[PDB]
Structures are given as structure tokens and as C-alpha cells.
Enzyme design. Structure first.
Site, short mmCIF file in Angstrom:
data_model
loop_
_atom_site.label_atom_id
_atom_site.label_comp_id
_atom_site.label_asym_id
_atom_site.label_seq_id
_atom_site.Cartn_x
_atom_site.Cartn_y
_atom_site.Cartn_z
N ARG A 84 0.77 -0.78 0.25
CA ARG A 84 -0.41 0.19 -0.01
C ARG A 84 0.95 1.24 0.30
O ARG A 84 1.81 1.11 0.74
CB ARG A 84 -0.68 0.18 1.05
N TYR A 232 -1.49 -4.54 -6.92
CA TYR A 232 -0.68 -5.29 -5.21
C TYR A 232 -1.56 -5.02 -3.74
O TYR A 232 -2.83 -3.65 -4.12
CB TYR A 232 0.41 -5.05 -4.56
N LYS A 241 -9.25 -3.20 1.94
CA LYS A 241 -9.39 -1.64 3.12
C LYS A 241 -9.87 -1.01 2.16
O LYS A 241 -10.63 -0.55 3.35
CB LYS A 241 -7.59 -1.82 2.99
N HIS A 261 -10.86 -1.86 12.07
CA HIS A 261 -9.88 -2.62 12.00
C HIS A 261 -9.84 -3.87 13.00
O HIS A 261 -8.54 -3.19 13.84
CB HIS A 261 -8.22 -1.31 11.93
N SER A 283 -1.70 -1.88 12.56
CA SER A 283 -0.83 -2.92 11.23
C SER A 283 0.08 -4.28 11.79
O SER A 283 0.24 -5.20 11.18
CB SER A 283 -1.19 -2.63 9.56
N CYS A 285 1.61 -4.60 14.19
CA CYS A 285 1.26 -5.43 15.18
C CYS A 285 0.42 -6.72 15.59
O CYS A 285 0.33 -7.59 14.28
CB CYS A 285 0.50 -5.17 16.23
N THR A 288 -2.78 -11.62 13.41
CA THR A 288 -3.31 -13.16 13.63
C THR A 288 -2.40 -13.87 14.82
O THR A 288 -3.14 -14.69 15.60
CB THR A 288 -2.63 -12.88 12.25
N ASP A 308 -8.73 -9.85 11.03
CA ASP A 308 -7.77 -7.46 10.30
C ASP A 308 -9.28 -7.13 10.66
O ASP A 308 -9.06 -5.77 11.17
CB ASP A 308 -7.58 -8.28 9.28
N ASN A 396 6.35 -6.84 3.45
CA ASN A 396 5.04 -7.01 3.03
C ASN A 396 5.02 -7.99 2.13
O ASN A 396 3.98 -7.85 1.88
CB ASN A 396 5.22 -5.34 3.17
N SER A 397 6.00 -9.24 2.19
CA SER A 397 5.62 -10.57 2.07
C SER A 397 3.97 -11.02 2.62
O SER A 397 4.10 -10.77 3.57
CB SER A 397 6.01 -11.17 1.65
N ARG A 398 3.69 -11.40 1.28
CA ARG A 398 1.93 -12.50 2.13
C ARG A 398 2.03 -13.52 1.65
O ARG A 398 2.29 -14.17 0.89
CB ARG A 398 0.89 -11.54 1.47
N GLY A 519 1.61 -17.44 23.26
CA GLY A 519 0.50 -18.26 24.03
C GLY A 519 0.30 -17.67 25.33
O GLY A 519 -0.73 -17.89 25.83
N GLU A 520 1.26 -17.40 25.82
CA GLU A 520 1.12 -16.30 27.50
C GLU A 520 0.36 -15.49 27.87
O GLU A 520 -0.22 -15.59 28.96
CB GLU A 520 2.52 -16.40 27.80
N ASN A 521 -0.14 -15.05 26.00
CA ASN A 521 -0.75 -14.08 26.36
C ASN A 521 -2.56 -14.45 26.93
O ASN A 521 -3.60 -13.90 27.20
CB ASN A 521 -0.85 -13.36 25.24
O1 1WD Z 1 4.19 -6.13 19.84
C1 1WD Z 1 3.89 -5.57 21.21
O2 1WD Z 1 4.30 -6.22 22.12
C2 1WD Z 1 1.86 -5.35 21.04
N1 1WD Z 1 1.59 -5.54 22.23
C3 1WD Z 1 0.38 -5.27 22.13
C4 1WD Z 1 -0.63 -4.55 21.03
C5 1WD Z 1 0.45 -4.36 20.14
C6 1WD Z 1 1.32 -4.72 20.14
S1 1WD Z 1 2.57 -4.53 18.71
CL CL Z 2 -0.26 -4.59 1.30
MN MN Z 3 -4.74 -5.00 8.45
#
Ligand code: 1WD
Ligand code: CL
Ligand code: MN
Ligand code: MN
Ligand code: NA
Length: 610
Positions: A84, A232, A241, A261, A283, A285, A288, A308, A396-398, A519-521
Site C-alpha cells: 500500500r 498489490y 481495505k 480494524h 498493522s 502488530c 493474526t 483483520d 510486506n510479503s504475504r 501463548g502466555e497472552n
Molecule cells: O508487540 C507488542 O508488544 C504489542 N502489544 C500489544 C499490542 C500490539 C503490539 S504490536
Molecule cells: Cl498490501
Molecule cells: Mn490490517
């Protein structure tokens, strides 16, 4: 008609113009007249159409089959056309202020407006004859489950088979959509790579694009999206978007709903009780990663609704219902591993299109952070088609993959009434100052917390503002967006979800992560869940509620320094409030709602009493 009229029936190679809804036919035939494609292909969405299109692209050098997997493909682009381009993305309205606030002192970072007159000149300089020698594909698509009352339909015209294939994965498309649509309203989506035949300029890497003339435009009052010169991602797959955030956010404002978002996940505790949460992170962060989390806590399950975009509307009972308007995941590849995201790695092993990743000599994919040692003699070809040794993939590969293939896809991910959201999570990467998690004091406070979002950019380091994670995506004036969110508190019956903010990135004085993450989150999601149930598991602080001592389950972590992880410094927060003040004053200016200024003053005040 006195000659052949403006009838393009002779050029139709699949489908029939006569079977189209009247307004869809007008849209197709007008643009055929303008763009001069050789053929018109009305997509049906069938497997046969898809298989054939992929084989054809393969024959023209446009994609390669990845032989390590079941029906996976690789595209490598012209390096001019990889992402983008915010500076060539624009919204057209009669008045600039309706699109973006007029900033007080600087340039706006909250959108880019273009006048109708300037856009007409730009359009006339680009689209006439732009599809000469090419097929115009007509992609009828639904954003949302087919026939959901929350879904919206579009028609994308494109001269790119790659867009057609990707839109098959990322949206619901084909004949069933035209049948659902009938004579209803639809978003008009026009796209061209801007390389009519015979080619005027060199074709690089078998990837048609026109970088100099690249322009991604949105006309919300016309219900149009017009995009030229990039093939792209977010520039060419117009559902995602352009439609589902920019146009949709404006529709949402008109209609009383939200287009946001946000990922959507379902979380089930060890006793079988389930909630849905939505989360907005920048974006850059790990949305996913969170949406597909493999939770470490025993008896907890996370299931993915989307990674997303969320469309959310209060139902007649007051529940906030959310759908994922997408049909797939268009995920950033680098950093995806078995450790960061095992369920993503599973999803993408079948029926997936990769773009600008590296390829292993055994026909597999590779990228920075895949965290997977290569077998003995396996070599690498970079995304630039050259041999590579231990970037191999563009940042920015996908991957572009069917959502139905996610091994933890939520059973209700396509339920037409949507899933009931009970918490909304904001977050950003903050190496200092900001606790692991806190809870907003009210709806108004929560809206302020969204507004105040900041995040460290990927690299010296810069901390940038990204309100609601929507900075590149607002379809209209962000001040008015804030007023729209605030208005939800006055909607009769509305059950306003609890709002949280997270930060996985807080570092000690040595630069070491204070929290293990991944996964501790799930330990943080557990606290949120209990707070939604009314558990007395929170301690009041100036910034909001934080977990009480011993409220977070740290079993299995050893000695987590919760003291530093939840530390709130008056000095830090004084500086933080000032930066948020200066930012909102400048960027939102006259359109900053009273209640957001009030929440800013209240936070300054609570910090003053520390
Ligand atoms: O990567 C991080 O630490 C993070 N924590 C919370 C929400 C977004 C992000 S990018
Ligand atoms: Cl893109
Ligand atoms: Mn997004
Ligand atoms: Mn109010
Ligand atoms: Na290529």
C-alpha cells in the site's frame, strides 16, 4: 442503435451481459467502453474457473507452482509494487473537512483528500484504453457471509488474474453473489494495472504495474472505489481495505454501525463458558498471532473469527454483533513461525497464494523469522529471484489463504447474525511506561484510550500515533468518527462492551521483555474474561483498572516481575498526557469531541494527584 451501440456482448467470454442485474450491466459496459478490454469474463467463482486461471498465469510466467505443497502458488512482483502507498491513497468528497479534520498547525496524518475536479483529471489521464489487449474480469463479491443482514456486495472489474484468484480466497465471489444481489445496491470497484497492450514500458518480473500513475481512490458519496497502477494487496484487492474499512466506515456512520480494524476471537475457559472479543492493533502488530493463539493455560481455547476487519452492529437486544467481512487471511509472512503462530503455519499448507516470499530448492516457502532449520542440501531463492544465504523475503510479503482452513476457525465465523462482542481491546508496542493490561473506566474513557493509541514503529525508534489502529483507513473525519463511537452510549438498549488496552512489549532497563508473550497472552485474556463476568479482580489506578496482586495466573511462568510490568510512573504519564494533548489538538482540532477533551483533562487530573 445506429451501429453496434455500446453493446459489448460480442466480447463476453464467460457469462452473459443479459443475465446481469441492470445496474451491474451498466457498470460493466460503461467501463468496457472506457477501458477497451479485448474480452469480458464474468466470474462464476467455480473451482474450474479458479484452476484454469492459475494454470494460465503459470503459462504466462506470472506465478510459479510451489511443488512442496498441495495447490500453492508464488508470485514475485516488480519491486516498485510491493505495498500500500499511503501517499497515493485518497478520498474524494465535496468538502475536505468531511474526509479529514483541518489540522491546527501541521499536515494531517489522518487521511488524504482530493477534490472531485482534481480526481476527474487524474482519472482521465489513466483509465481511457487502459485494458486494451486484456480481459476485464467481473468479480461479484460479498463482504460477509452470503446473505447475512450485515454483509454488503461489491462488483470489482479488474484486468489482473492475480486479483481474481486472490479475491476468490479473500471474499465470497461468483454467481451466487449475483443471484443474492438482484437489483440491490452494490459498491462499484474498478481496478487496472495500467499496462495496456502493446506494452509501452518494460514488463518487470512478469508483474504488470504502473508505479508513476498509481492512485487508489475512494468516492463514498458515489459508492465507488477506483484504483489504478498497483497490482498489490490492499491497492488491488478492493474488498479489504478500500471497501471494508474506508467505504464501509462511512456507510457505518450513515447507518449506525462500526467498521473497524479489529480481529475477532472466541475464548472458552476451562468450564466451557465462551466469549467473543475484538481487538485493534496497528498493522505492524500481531493481530493474526492473537486471533489464532495457542493458549498455554490448561483448559482454555481460542478460536478465530477473523484476523483483520470487523463489522459491528448493535442488535435489537443491545448485543454488539460482529462479522468478519473477509473469507480468508491476507497475512504478513515474515515472522510467522511454529512458535509465534502454529495455527497459521497449518492453514497455509494447502490452497494458498504467496507473494514475495523466498522459495526453497525443494519448492517450499521461506522468510525471515520462520524459525525452521533447513534440511542438508536445501538452498534458497530470494523474493528477487536470486540465490540467497543466511532479506530473503520482502518485509510486506504475504500469504493469502482460505479462512475455512484454519484448524481453530470458530464455529460461528460465518454465522449471519454475527458473534456477540463482550470486550474490545486496544493495544500498541510500548517499551516503557505502559502496563501489560488495563481496563477503561467507562465507555467515554474507552473511546479516549482508542484515540490515544501509540506504538513503536519497526526500525532509532519512533513512537507513532495510530488511533483505533485506523490511521491509514479512516473513511471520513476522525473527529466525527470519535463522535460516532461516543454516540453509542446514548443508543437505547445498547450493552456497551468493556474496553481494555494491552502491551506485550514493555522492557526492563536492559531492554529485556518483561512479559513472555505468545501463548502466555492467554493469561491476560483470562483476566479480561473474569472482569467481564464481574469478578473483583481489579485495582484502580489513574490510567484505569489493573489486575490486583495475585489476580493474574502466573503458574508456569516462574518469577514474573509484576511490580515493574504494572508500574505507573507520574513522570511517564505526565509526558504521555502532554503528547496525547498536543496530538489531538493538532490533528483533530475543531472536530475533537467535548467528551474526549474531558477524558484528557480527567486523566491529567488523576495523574496530578499521584
Ligand atoms: O508487540 C507488542 O508488544 C504489542 N502489544 C500489544 C499490542 C500490539 C503490539 S504490536
Ligand atoms: Cl498490501
Ligand atoms: Mn490490517
Ligand atoms: Mn455522551
Ligand atoms: Na513475477
Amino acid at each position: 442503435q445506429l451501429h453496434n451501440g455500446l453493446d459489448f456482448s460480442a466480447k463476453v467470454i464467460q457469462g452473459s451481459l443479459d443475465s446481469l442485474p441492470q445496474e451491474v450491466r451498466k457498470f460493466v459496459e460503461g467501463n468496457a467502453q472506457l477501458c477497451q478490454p479485448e474480452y469480458i469474463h464474468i466470474c462464476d467463482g467455480s473451482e474450474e474457473e479458479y484452476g484454469r486461471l492459475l494454470a494460465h498465469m503459470q503459462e504466462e510466467g506470472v506465478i510459479r507452482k510451489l511443488k512442496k505443497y498441495d495447490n500453492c502458488w508464488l508470485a514475485l512482483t516488480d519491486p516498485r509494487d510491493v505495498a500500500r502507498i499511503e501517499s497515493k491513497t485518497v478520498i474524494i468528497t465535496q468538502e475536505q473537512r468531511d474526509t479529514v479534520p483541518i489540522p491546527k498547525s501541521g499536515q494531517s496524518q489522518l487521511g488524504r483528500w482530493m477534490s472531485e475536479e482534481d480526481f476527474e483529471k487524474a482519472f482521465n489521464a489513466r483509465f481511457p484504453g487502459c485494458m486494451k489487449g486484456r480481459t476485464m474480469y467481473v468479480i461479484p463479491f460479498s463482504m460477509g457471509p452470503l446473505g447475512s443482514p450485515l454483509a454488503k456486495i461489491g462488483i470489482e472489474l479488474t484486468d489482473s488474474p492475480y486479483v481474481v484468484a486472490s479475491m476468490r480466497i479473500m471474499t465470497r465471489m461468483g454467481t451466487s453473489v449475483l443471484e443474492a444481489l438482484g437489483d440491490g445496491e452494490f459498491i462499484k470497484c474498478l481496478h487496472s494495472v495500467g499496462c495496456p497492450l502493446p506494452l509501452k514500458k518494460p514488463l518487470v518480473n512478469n508483474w504488470a504495474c504502473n508505479p508513476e500513475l498509481t492512485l487508489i481512490a475512494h468516492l463514498p458519496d458515489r459508492r465507488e472505489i477506483i484504483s489504478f497502477g498497483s497490482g498489490y494487496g490492499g491497492n488491488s484487492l478492493l474488498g479489504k481495505k478500500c471497501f471494508a474499512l474506508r467505504i464501509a466506515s462511512r456507510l457505518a456512520k450513515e447507518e449506525g454501525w462500526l467498521a473497524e480494524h479489529m480481529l475477532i476471537l472466541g475464548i472458552t475457559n476451562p468450564e466451557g463458558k465462551k466469549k467473543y472479543l475484538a481487538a485493534a492493533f496497528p498493522s505492524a502488530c500481531g493481530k493474526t498471532n492473537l486471533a489464532m493463539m495457542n493458549p498455554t493455560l490448561p483448559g482454555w481455547k481460542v478460536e478465530c473469527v477473523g484476523d483483520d476487519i470487523a463489522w459491528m452492529k448493535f442488535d435489537a437486544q443491545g448485543n454488539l454483533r460482529a462479522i468478519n467481512p473477509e473469507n480468508g487471511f491476507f497475512g504478513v509472512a515474515p515472522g510467522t513461525s511454529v512458535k509465534t503462530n502454529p495455527n497459521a503455519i497449518k492453514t497455509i499448507q494447502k490452497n494458498t497464494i504467496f507473494t514475495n516470499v523466498a522459495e526453497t530448492s525443494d519448492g517450499g516457502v521461506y522468510w525471515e523469522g520462520i524459525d525452521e532449520p533447513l534440511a542438508p542440501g536445501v538452498t534458497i531463492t530470494s523474493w528477487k529471484n536470486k540465490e540467497w544465504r543466511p532479506p530473503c523475503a520482502h518485509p510486506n510479503s504475504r500469504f493469502c489463504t482460505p479462512a475455512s482452513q484454519c484448524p481453530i476457525i470458530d464455529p460461528a465465523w460465518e454465522s449471519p447474525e454475527g458473534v456477540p462482542i463482550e470486550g474490545i481491546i486496544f493495544g500498541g508496542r510500548r517499551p516503557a511506561g505502559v502496563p501489560l493490561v488495563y481496563e477503561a473506566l467507562s465507555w467515554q474513557h474507552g473511546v479516549f484510550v482508542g484515540a490515544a493509541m501509540r506504538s513503536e514503529a519497526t526500525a532509532g525508534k519512533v513512537i507513532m500515533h495510530d488511533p483505533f489502529a485506523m490511521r491509514p483507513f479512516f473513511g471520513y473525519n476522525f473527529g466525527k468518527y470519535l463522535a460516532h463511537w461516543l454516540s453509542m452510549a446514548h443508543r437505547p438498549a445498547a450493552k456497551l462492551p468493556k474496553i481494555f488496552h494491552v502491551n506485550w512489549f514493555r522492557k526492563d532497563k536492559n531492554g529485556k521483555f518483561l512479559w513472555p508473550g505468545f501463548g502466555e497472552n492467554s493469561r491476560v485474556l483470562e483476566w479480561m474474561f473474569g472482569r467481564i463476568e464481574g469478578e473483583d479482580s481489579a485495582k484502580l489506578t489513574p490510567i484505569g483498572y489493573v489486575p490486583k496482586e495475585d489476580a493474574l495466573n502466573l503458574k508456569g511462568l516462574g518469577d514474573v516481575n509484576v511490580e515493574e510490568l504494572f508500574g505507573i510512573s507520574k513522570e511517564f504519564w505526565e509526558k504521555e498526557v502532554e503528547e496525547i494533548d498536543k496530538y489531538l489538538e493538532d490533528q483533530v482540532n475543531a472536530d475533537l469531541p467535548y467528551e474526549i477533551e474531558r477524558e484528557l483533562r480527567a486523566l491529567k487530573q488523576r495523574i496530578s494527584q499521584m
